[PDB]
RNA sequence: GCGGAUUUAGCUCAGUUGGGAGAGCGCCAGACUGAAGAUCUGGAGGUCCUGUGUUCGAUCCACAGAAUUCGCACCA
């Protein structure tokens, strides 16, 4: 609504994750003050700007995502600050589908905890290529050794989930520091100050370590609903991080999954941190309204494709990996009839799994392949990966194999 | 997104503190009546919405889903 947005730097999604309180979401806003400093047009935000609701306000915890944007000299970011909590991982789940790299934020007053594994783990499963850590809550500690040893911690638990951890950029810091200082004064540069000189450090990790991705502008429209709204005056809004291709107002789509019909829309509106945009390409965080759709036919977890573009379905088979207890899973066997819930990108729906001949029950850490059919259909694709969470808890991390309905 | 309710027989609802359900209508047999409705004797009918945890055992508890509802949050 407040401007028109022009591209001038390469875009990238980013944002928050680790343990419950390790400091997500002050670094967030310590990261926005910061490059507003040498990048004007950077509208700065609060905690209070952030956790915002009142329950937020009040528990003094995250539990919806935020979306927030901020730039450096080399690119524009759209940055989604995750909870913590694990009462909360689907809304986490659905943030970090959106990113293009994270931030794994762990305090160094802590270690690594729960959370910390669940959502590096997380994240893979639904995407994130690439981890920075900003190690914490620094000024609260002084042995090296302790500090040296968090280290240590967090890369090999990014190896155990894959992740390089042995090139992982890990930055120590204060993020409360850094921002308690843009608060004294707002205008501070790189080499000012301390504090927030760690955030530059933050800063450039993200601009150089996250390589900008590459776009299939070309191959056909594809954008995973991440939330919707229902805008004043305008209509109904999905927002979203664009898949591949590309949309323009006036181009018409499609609405699949997650129920009985696939449904038509034209696209009337494409914003992007609530700017203008002629047309937003595959990357952008962006928001479209949609010709005539209610809240109800349009919700998280559905997928907007060029018509016709794409198939919902049911089942398929997978190839998945069940985690031992001790990796935060399931701690007993499961057979056929167990019906958990599948994470495929933004989507989240429950579904039966069938173990193949041969096998009976399954147990935790092993490595099975089954066959599952979705209580609702959505928009699959052999190699897409997915996280299997059921009971408050992550118990698997698989990918499709083949689609079988 | 968050949080509460609710889901039990064909229908509408009661139970419960884990040993596993019960009534009114609704059906049926026998009685009565030409028959019907009332009455009277019996009789049949439920994965107790679903998965998992716990447990010797889960309708019930815990944790997770669905569907319906109702608060609250978010606001390209
Ligand atoms: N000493 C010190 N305390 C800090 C620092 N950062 C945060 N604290 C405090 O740590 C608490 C957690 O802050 P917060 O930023 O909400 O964390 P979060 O990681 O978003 N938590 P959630 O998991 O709820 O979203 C807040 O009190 C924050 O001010 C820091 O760098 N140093
Ligand atoms: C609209 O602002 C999007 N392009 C950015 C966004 C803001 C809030 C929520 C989701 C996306
Ligand atoms: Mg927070
Ligand atoms: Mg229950």
């Keep these: 609504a407040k401007g028109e947005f022009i ?5 990238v999604n980013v944002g928050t994750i680790g343990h419950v309180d390790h ?4 670094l967030t806003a310590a990261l926005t003050y910061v490059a507003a400093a040498e990048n004007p047009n950077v509208e700065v935000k609060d905690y209070g700007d952030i956790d915002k609701a009142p329950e937020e306000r009040a528990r ?3 539990i919806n995502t935020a979306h927030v944007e901020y730039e450096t000299a080399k690119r524009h970011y759209s940055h989604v600050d995750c909870p913590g909590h694990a009462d909360y991982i689907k809304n986490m789940i659905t943030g970090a589908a959106q990113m293009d790299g994270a931030i794994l934020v762990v305090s160094a007053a802590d270690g690594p905890m729960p959370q910390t594994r669940e959502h590096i783990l997380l994240a893979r499963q639904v995407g994130v290529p690439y981890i920075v850590v900003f190690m914490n809550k620094v000024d609260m500690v002084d042995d090296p050794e302790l500090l040296d040893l968090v280290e240590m911690e967090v890369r090999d638990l990014l190896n155990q989930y894959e992740f390089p951890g042995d090139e992982v950029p890990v930055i120590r810091g204060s993020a409360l520091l850094a921002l308690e200082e843009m608060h004294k004064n707002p205008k501070t540069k790189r080499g000012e100050n301390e504090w927030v000189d760690k955030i530059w450090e933050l ?18 429209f594809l954008m ?3 939330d919707v709204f229902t805008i004043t005056g305008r209509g109904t809004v999905a927002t979203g991080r664009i898949e591949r291709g590309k949309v323009k107002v006036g181009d018409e789509v499609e609405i699949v999954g997650l129920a009985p019909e696939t449904r038509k829309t ?3 509106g494409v914003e992007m941190h609530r700017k203008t945009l002629q047309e937003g390409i595959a990357g952008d965080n962006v928001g479209l309204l949609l010709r005539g759709v209610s809240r109800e036919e349009v919700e998280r977890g559905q997928v907007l494709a060029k018509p016709g573009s794409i198939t919902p379905h049911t089942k398929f088979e997978a190839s998945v990996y069940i985690l031992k207890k001790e990796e935060g899973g399931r701690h007993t066997g499961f057979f056929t009839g167990y019906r958990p819930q599948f994470y495929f990108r933004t989507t989240d729906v429950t579904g039966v799994v069938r173990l193949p001949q041969g096998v009976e029950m399954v147990m935790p850490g092993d490595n099975v392949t089954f066959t599952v059919e979705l209580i609702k259909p959505v928009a699959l694709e ?11 808890r992550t118990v698997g ?3 499709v194999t083949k689609i079988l309905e």
């Design 7 to 11: 591209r001038t730097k390469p875009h």
């Design 23 to 26: 400091g997500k979401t002050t």
């Design 60 to 62: 003094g915890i995250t």
């Design 203 to 220: 800063l450039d990790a993200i601009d150089e370590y996250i390589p900008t991705p590459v776009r299939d502008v070309d191959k056909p």
């Design 224 to 226: 995973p609903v991440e």
């Design 266 to 268: 034209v696209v009337t």
């Design 382 to 392: 052999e190699g897409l990966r997915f996280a299997i969470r059921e009971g408050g």
């Design 397 to 399: 991390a698989g990918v």
